[PDB]
Design an enzyme around this catalytic site. Sequence first.
Site, PDB file in Angstrom:
ATOM      1  N   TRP A   1      -9.058   6.720  -0.605  1.00 46.23           N
ATOM      2  CA  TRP A   1      -9.354   7.477  -1.810  1.00 46.23           C
ATOM      3  C   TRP A   1      -8.397   7.030  -2.915  1.00 46.23           C
ATOM      4  CZ3 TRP A   1      -8.069  10.168   2.771  1.00 46.23           C
ATOM      5  CH2 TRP A   1      -6.725  10.553   2.879  1.00 46.23           C
TER       6      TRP A   1
ATOM      7  N   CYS B   1       0.838  -1.196   0.000  1.00 43.70           N
ATOM      8  CA  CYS B   1       0.000   0.000   0.000  1.00 43.70           C
ATOM      9  C   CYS B   1       0.870   1.242   0.000  1.00 43.70           C
ATOM     10  CB  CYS B   1      -0.932   0.029   1.216  1.00 43.70           C
ATOM     11  SG  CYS B   1      -1.895   1.571   1.322  1.00 43.70           S
TER      12      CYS B   1
ATOM     13  N   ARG C   1       0.165   4.656   2.886  1.00 41.15           N
ATOM     14  CA  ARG C   1       0.226   4.410   4.324  1.00 41.15           C
ATOM     15  C   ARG C   1       0.670   5.610   5.145  1.00 41.15           C
ATOM     16  NH1 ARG C   1       3.948  -0.704   4.804  1.00 41.15           N
ATOM     17  NH2 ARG C   1       4.438  -0.182   2.616  1.00 41.15           N
TER      18      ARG C   1
ATOM     19  N   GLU D   1      -4.813   4.144 -10.618  1.00 45.56           N
ATOM     20  CA  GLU D   1      -5.662   2.971 -10.438  1.00 45.56           C
ATOM     21  C   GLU D   1      -6.808   2.975 -11.445  1.00 45.56           C
ATOM     22  OE1 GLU D   1      -6.212   1.718  -6.174  1.00 45.56           O
ATOM     23  OE2 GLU D   1      -5.744   3.831  -5.816  1.00 45.56           O
TER      24      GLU D   1
HETATM   25  C1  HEM Z   1      -5.977   6.725   1.895  1.00 47.86           C
HETATM   26  C2  HEM Z   1      -5.590   6.571   0.626  1.00 47.86           C
HETATM   27  C3  HEM Z   1      -5.050   5.238   0.069  1.00 47.86           C
HETATM   28  C4  HEM Z   1      -4.411   5.162  -1.091  1.00 47.86           C
HETATM   29  C5  HEM Z   1      -4.104   6.370  -2.012  1.00 47.86           C
HETATM   30  C6  HEM Z   1      -4.053   3.773  -1.307  1.00 47.86           C
HETATM   31  C7  HEM Z   1      -3.379   3.288  -2.400  1.00 47.86           C
HETATM   32  C8  HEM Z   1      -3.186   1.956  -2.663  1.00 47.86           C
HETATM   33  C9  HEM Z   1      -2.803   1.394  -3.940  1.00 47.86           C
HETATM   34  C10 HEM Z   1      -2.602   2.218  -5.226  1.00 47.86           C
HETATM   35  C11 HEM Z   1      -2.673   0.081  -3.785  1.00 47.86           C
HETATM   36  C12 HEM Z   1      -2.309  -0.926  -4.890  1.00 47.86           C
HETATM   37  C13 HEM Z   1      -3.622  -1.589  -5.291  1.00 47.86           C
HETATM   38  C14 HEM Z   1      -3.710  -1.798  -6.778  1.00 47.86           C
HETATM   39  O1  HEM Z   1      -2.838  -1.307  -7.535  1.00 47.86           O
HETATM   40  O2  HEM Z   1      -4.678  -2.464  -7.206  1.00 47.86           O
HETATM   41  C15 HEM Z   1      -2.973  -0.250  -2.399  1.00 47.86           C
HETATM   42  C16 HEM Z   1      -2.944  -1.497  -1.793  1.00 47.86           C
HETATM   43  C17 HEM Z   1      -3.405  -1.788  -0.528  1.00 47.86           C
HETATM   44  N1  HEM Z   1      -4.065  -0.899   0.315  1.00 47.86           N
HETATM   45 FE1  HEM Z   1      -3.966   1.120   0.222  1.00 47.86          FE
HETATM   46  N2  HEM Z   1      -4.519   3.014  -0.238  1.00 47.86           N
HETATM   47  C18 HEM Z   1      -5.147   3.898   0.640  1.00 47.86           C
HETATM   48  C19 HEM Z   1      -5.778   3.555   1.828  1.00 47.86           C
HETATM   49  C20 HEM Z   1      -5.852   2.303   2.405  1.00 47.86           C
HETATM   50  C21 HEM Z   1      -6.595   1.909   3.596  1.00 47.86           C
HETATM   51  C22 HEM Z   1      -7.487   2.853   4.449  1.00 47.86           C
HETATM   52  C23 HEM Z   1      -6.377   0.593   3.775  1.00 47.86           C
HETATM   53  C24 HEM Z   1      -6.859  -0.360   4.889  1.00 47.86           C
HETATM   54  C25 HEM Z   1      -7.313   0.091   6.059  1.00 47.86           C
HETATM   55  C26 HEM Z   1      -5.499   0.137   2.717  1.00 47.86           C
HETATM   56  C27 HEM Z   1      -5.035  -1.143   2.567  1.00 47.86           C
HETATM   57  C28 HEM Z   1      -4.370  -1.609   1.469  1.00 47.86           C
HETATM   58  C29 HEM Z   1      -3.893  -2.959   1.345  1.00 47.86           C
HETATM   59  C30 HEM Z   1      -4.038  -4.063   2.423  1.00 47.86           C
HETATM   60  C31 HEM Z   1      -3.316  -3.071   0.149  1.00 47.86           C
HETATM   61  C32 HEM Z   1      -2.620  -4.340  -0.377  1.00 47.86           C
HETATM   62  C33 HEM Z   1      -3.510  -5.442  -0.921  1.00 47.86           C
HETATM   63  C34 HEM Z   1      -2.625  -6.639  -1.184  1.00 47.86           C
HETATM   64  O3  HEM Z   1      -1.817  -7.028  -0.290  1.00 47.86           O
HETATM   65  O4  HEM Z   1      -2.732  -7.208  -2.292  1.00 47.86           O
HETATM   66  N3  HEM Z   1      -5.213   1.191   1.906  1.00 47.86           N
HETATM   67  N4  HEM Z   1      -3.260   0.929  -1.755  1.00 47.86           N
HETATM   68  C1  OS7 Z   2      -8.226   1.440   0.499  1.00 50.58           C
HETATM   69  C2  OS7 Z   2      -7.686   1.506  -0.903  1.00 50.58           C
HETATM   70  C3  OS7 Z   2      -7.523   2.716  -1.579  1.00 50.58           C
HETATM   71  C4  OS7 Z   2      -7.014   2.709  -2.885  1.00 50.58           C
HETATM   72  N1  OS7 Z   2      -6.829   3.856  -3.590  1.00 50.58           N
HETATM   73  N2  OS7 Z   2      -6.683   1.543  -3.478  1.00 50.58           N
HETATM   74  C5  OS7 Z   2      -6.830   0.370  -2.830  1.00 50.58           C
HETATM   75  C6  OS7 Z   2      -6.482  -0.805  -3.477  1.00 50.58           C
HETATM   76  C7  OS7 Z   2      -6.611  -2.024  -2.829  1.00 50.58           C
HETATM   77  C8  OS7 Z   2      -6.281  -3.273  -3.558  1.00 50.58           C
HETATM   78  C9  OS7 Z   2      -5.659  -4.364  -2.992  1.00 50.58           C
HETATM   79  C10 OS7 Z   2      -5.421  -5.504  -3.759  1.00 50.58           C
HETATM   80  C11 OS7 Z   2      -5.831  -5.602  -5.092  1.00 50.58           C
HETATM   81  O1  OS7 Z   2      -5.525  -6.777  -5.760  1.00 50.58           O
HETATM   82  C12 OS7 Z   2      -6.407  -7.587  -6.551  1.00 50.58           C
HETATM   83  C13 OS7 Z   2      -5.798  -8.950  -6.773  1.00 50.58           C
HETATM   84  C14 OS7 Z   2      -4.895  -9.425  -5.841  1.00 50.58           C
HETATM   85  C15 OS7 Z   2      -4.343 -10.679  -6.034  1.00 50.58           C
HETATM   86  C16 OS7 Z   2      -4.705 -11.424  -7.149  1.00 50.58           C
HETATM   87  C17 OS7 Z   2      -5.602 -10.906  -8.069  1.00 50.58           C
HETATM   88  N3  OS7 Z   2      -6.128  -9.692  -7.860  1.00 50.58           N
HETATM   89  C18 OS7 Z   2      -6.479  -4.497  -5.657  1.00 50.58           C
HETATM   90  C19 OS7 Z   2      -6.987  -4.449  -7.084  1.00 50.58           C
HETATM   91  N4  OS7 Z   2      -8.435  -4.174  -7.093  1.00 50.58           N
HETATM   92  C20 OS7 Z   2      -6.711  -3.365  -4.876  1.00 50.58           C
HETATM   93  C21 OS7 Z   2      -7.095  -2.065  -1.529  1.00 50.58           C
HETATM   94  C22 OS7 Z   2      -7.469  -0.890  -0.885  1.00 50.58           C
HETATM   95  C23 OS7 Z   2      -7.324   0.328  -1.536  1.00 50.58           C
END
Ligand code: HEM
Ligand code: OS7
Lengths: 411, 411
Positions: A280, A108, A111, A285
């Site tokens: 947000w 993420c 963070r 994305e």
């Molecule tokens: C506040 C603004 C936030 C932004 C801009 C943000 C941004 C992102 C982005 C761009 C990703 C990659 C996901 C993708 O490319 O599909 C990600 C992953 C992730 N976000 Fe954040 N996020 C935010 C808030 C949060 C919050 C509030 C949580 C949980 C309480 C969170 C938990 C996670 C987790 C657990 C992942 C990883 C999922 C995995 O392990 O595959 N995020 N985030």
């Molecule tokens: C809170 C928040 C804000 C933000 N801006 N983006 C967030 C993106 C994710 C998040 C995590 C894992 C993901 O992985 C899909 C997957 C994994 C493994 C295999 C296949 N597909 C994706 C893709 N939808 C998104 C979670 C929270 C977010």
Amino acid sequence: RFLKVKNWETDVVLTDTLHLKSTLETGCTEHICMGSIMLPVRTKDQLFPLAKEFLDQYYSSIKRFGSKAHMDRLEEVNKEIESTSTYQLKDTELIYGAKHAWRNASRCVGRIQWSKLQVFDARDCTTAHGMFNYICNHVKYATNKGNLRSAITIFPQRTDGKHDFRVWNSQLIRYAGYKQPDGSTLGDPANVQFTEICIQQGWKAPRGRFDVLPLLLQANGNDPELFQIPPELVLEVPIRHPKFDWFKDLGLKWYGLPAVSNMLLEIGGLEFSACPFSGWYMGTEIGVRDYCDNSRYNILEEVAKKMDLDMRKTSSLWKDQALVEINIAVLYSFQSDKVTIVDHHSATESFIKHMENEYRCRGGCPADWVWIVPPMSGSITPVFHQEMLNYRLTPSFEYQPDPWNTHVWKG
Amino acid sequence: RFLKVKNWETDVVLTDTLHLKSTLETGCTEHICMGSIMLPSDVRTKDQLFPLAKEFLDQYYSSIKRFGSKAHMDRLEEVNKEIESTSTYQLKDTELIYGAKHAWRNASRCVGRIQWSKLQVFDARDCTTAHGMFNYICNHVKYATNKGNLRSAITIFPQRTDGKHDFRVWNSQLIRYAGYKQPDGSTLGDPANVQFTEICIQQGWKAPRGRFDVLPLLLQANGNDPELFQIPPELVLEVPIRHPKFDWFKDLGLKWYGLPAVSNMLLEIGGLEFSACPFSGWYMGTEIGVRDYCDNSRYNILEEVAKKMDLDMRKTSSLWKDQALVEINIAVLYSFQSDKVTIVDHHSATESFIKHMENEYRCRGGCPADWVWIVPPMSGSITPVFHQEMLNYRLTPSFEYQPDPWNTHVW
Ligand code: HEM
Ligand SMILES: Cc1cc(N)nc2cc(-c3ccc(OCc4ccccn4)c(CN)c3)ccc12
Ligand code: HEM
Ligand SMILES: Cc1cc(N)nc2cc(-c3ccc(OCc4ccccn4)c(CN)c3)ccc12
Ligand SMILES: C[C@H](O)[C@H](O)[C@H]1CNc2nc(N)[nH]c(=O)c2N1
Ligand SMILES: C[C@H](O)[C@H](O)[C@H]1CNc2nc(N)[nH]c(=O)c2N1
Ligand SMILES: [Zn+2]
């Protein structure tokens, strides 16, 4: 045993001791790196050490380690585990755990915000209708008329694995996808399978390109039930371009609130299988992945066509050129409608500042380079040049199988 | 233990067994992934050398389908006797060519490996002096350049003996531009070569002190002090950079060289160490246009380009950096193509690598690949490699890093 990471653009070197607190495994070995692999019930036997470790962390963080309150709570949890085979977190511990699962989420980039999470305690919920109500309130609170606020709603923990709470949606707000008999797809191709399930469960699909999916909610291990989010709660943004007037005529919009609802929250060995969380959007994305992945809306073609670029050979970089314009339009539209969004330059710069602060105050910051670097313009963002260490800390968010593959239907 | 890698854009799943033949270590453990660390890491003794030779000869004779044959056992014995006797051994020409080709084949960070079997190997093991090294290197440069129709080549100088008689090319590439730190504090030319540009001056060179001065060669034979030589300018093919739409682009005064020729790595074959083994292919456009021109620690031209485009540089969310970046990389490909100098864009190169990966999984059982390096530094997710899971592991014969010789040389 100290470990160093170097930023090759600034030569700043940081020292990681936090990885020593890491317990879980990465998937890698001394002989193979699984760093680009996407995906690499508890008995009371192993549960109390997990509780003790979490409670030592919790009481350390509040400067009460070894106190009478700390020792009494360990006692109380110990007796509750052998008596009842599980235990219940205090509200303070639940809030701490949810914030730290975000803090520990190595993929993420957002963070820097981890400590401002709004935690909604839904552990008194008992029915899908109750879940619908809690999720509506989450969506309204987090959306805040465009001034987005991070939030998580935590439904009851797993017990015997036969009574799980689950949100069957992968995100709270997502667009349907429909496979047509001619092989083409209408709407979001990523959601075809889930759309089919909803339709089979009785959802009347409008069969448009941007239909908000219904919520499919499972309480206490029962069959899931369909609910329609009130449309006045679903904030959407029409996508237009600041110089290209034809861009609006592509018919594109997106929803404002990204709210992931299929992950599992682990705290002190307890497993919260339904815990939707939201923040947000980072612009890429939507503009890079949602719109331009070949397996998603895949609009690079029409955009490059209406731009009248040279599309005969890839070395014209027409794909790259349309990609930038689409991502400009996403950012311009969200800012114009005053809906919170962050570009990838700002977000990666914030992450580097966060990361260095975490090394200073915490001894490290686990980080997954493969996921942190944005999917466009990688090396002109500061994270590209930043060495990172990836390891697993708890509390954590974990993947779990899709419920339709494991659920035992009541019929 | 027979591992699988999935492409998430196409659902194509390959099974990897080649990794079980992995020799060396990755730097990762089950507790920590070091996949984003740039450098994750005195002679071979008589004991260590023979197993290394046996392993290499075993795979060589398997490759020509003579495993377990007369010639195989005889060669095993012959090298075995020579190591017992001379404490080292000499490769036959056939084995040297095989070892060099497979070092490239095994280079997990190289996206250009579909070309691996078409490598021109120049045996320079009879070389004894820096003047001789210069001669071999001029011949390499002229052959590889081929008047713009570039050809892959490696030139292999004598192997390490006791670490005191090392052959080394002190330059990081055969052709690179000088870097000088300015009086006012800025940097003229290439900042990545400021230290080397000054070792050349602080050793004899007289610099034109321009922005694109081709550096002289600093060649070390048999452990002596290195010697300066100027590559004949008619052998250094350069490309003036212009844009197919922006006529002011030429006024920036940018050029680059046609031949990427890395000269500071170490080639390991059957335990033998070749410390001087310059190799060359042809450029992927982003190496110049994204990294060389737009890294902040390099020529860092983004500001000036965006200004001439009159983009709104006041906020990052206008994506002015991203827009300029695309145009710069359009110009690089346009100029090379116009002047008929071989170049590949990142869409073509990554599509070729996916095809290569499929080939290697089919005919060889796998392909070690480092996602962090394979994914191009712009437009990552619209190239097919972004969605391709990759397993990274170390096979020998191999190219390895070695310390810069001025930190080592008994001067
Ligand atoms: C506040 C603004 C936030 C932004 C801009 C943000 C941004 C992102 C982005 C761009 C990703 C990659 C996901 C993708 O490319 O599909 C990600 C992953 C992730 N976000 Fe954040 N996020 C935010 C808030 C949060 C919050 C509030 C949580 C949980 C309480 C969170 C938990 C996670 C987790 C657990 C992942 C990883 C999922 C995995 O392990 O595959 N995020 N985030
Ligand atoms: C809170 C928040 C804000 C933000 N801006 N983006 C967030 C993106 C994710 C998040 C995590 C894992 C993901 O992985 C899909 C997957 C994994 C493994 C295999 C296949 N597909 C994706 C893709 N939808 C998104 C979670 C929270 C977010
Ligand atoms: C023929 C066209 C070739 C292309 C287009 C190509 C492309 C690339 C690219 C883009 C990189 C990333 C390096 C960077 O970003 O600085 C790379 C790395 C590398 N290439 Fe290739 N390459 C080619 C030929 C060769 C040849 C002929 C060899 C050796 C015989 C070779 C060996 C390597 C090695 C050893 C690395 C990096 C290994 C490391 O750092 O550990 N390449 N290549
Ligand atoms: C044959 C060929 C063709 C081509 N088009 N590109 C090639 C790029 C490389 C290559 C590999 C490693 C590198 O290392 C970065 C680094 C690591 C650690 C510390 C500092 N820098 C560099 C840049 N120096 C270049 C090698 C051969 C190539
Ligand atoms: C195969 C590869 O690991 C996969 O495509 C990853 C790469 N990096 C990513 N990075 C982010 N932020 N999001 C993703 O979905 C992915 N996908
Ligand atoms: C810190 C990070 O490992 C470093 O910037 C790497 C990332 N990926 C790269 N990828 C390529 N092809 N070339 C590079 O020099 C780098 N640098
Ligand atoms: Zn790893």
